Amino acid sequence: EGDAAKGEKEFNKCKACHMVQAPDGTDIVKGGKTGPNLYGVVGRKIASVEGFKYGDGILEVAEKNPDMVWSEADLIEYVTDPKPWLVEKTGDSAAKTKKTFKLGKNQADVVAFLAQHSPDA
Template sequence: MFDTMTLTKVAAGLCGAWLILLLGKWVAEETYHVAGHGEQAYVIEVAEAEGGGEEEEQVDIAALVAEADVDKGATVFRKCTACHKLDGSDGVGPHLNGVVGRDIASVGGFSYSGALQEKEGAWTPENLSGFLEKPSSWAAGTSMGFAGLNKVEDRANVIAYLQSTGG
């Protein structure tokens, strides 16, 4: 089937390819070797930021909601209308008619994710703000694919708007 010369050529080709691979790997490791840099020659000392990130936690969301702009909340709420309705009917997400003060995962007939079913309590302004900031962090494993509202003012405006729609 194969003569000796063909078998020798195939073996030499495989060995040559292996050699090129090993040499290429060696050159790449020598060229891009990260661990061999040694000690840093000049270090810039930076004072630790005291209270970094705590400002957001100390914000009184209830006070912000009381002062919020309902019209701006209606504008921001347009992002939510792709999945949520205010008329009492469910869409991709549960209806948000009367959501402020309602128990979490309590809309009858809607299939909530396990992450929200495990949460207890009501949709207080604080809970809504935490959820709207980043749903996947507040309720890890939620099926809500919304990235969140970074600005606390936007969250307060949306919550004020949801309160104004009643239920």
């Protein structure tokens, strides 16, 4: 039950590493390249952005669950605390992650913002 307008503001915490760019090249949120493009992330297969070098943990999630896509519930959990999410999904206490950034509040709002820019979900 997120507020996409509030999520757009919270996304300032994400944009250091993530852009939101449409397939025609249009920049919705200009941001960094340390993490993958988040345009269309809602409903997207886990760890499937072409050309991005993902960590072993999240690829294992994708490998072990080939039909898994990002749902709003899962995105909320992952953005709250990425590492334990990977541990939960892989069953591997040593799951490797390229990021540990945690968002403690307004997670549903950020996910609402991302859903807004996943129009074909």
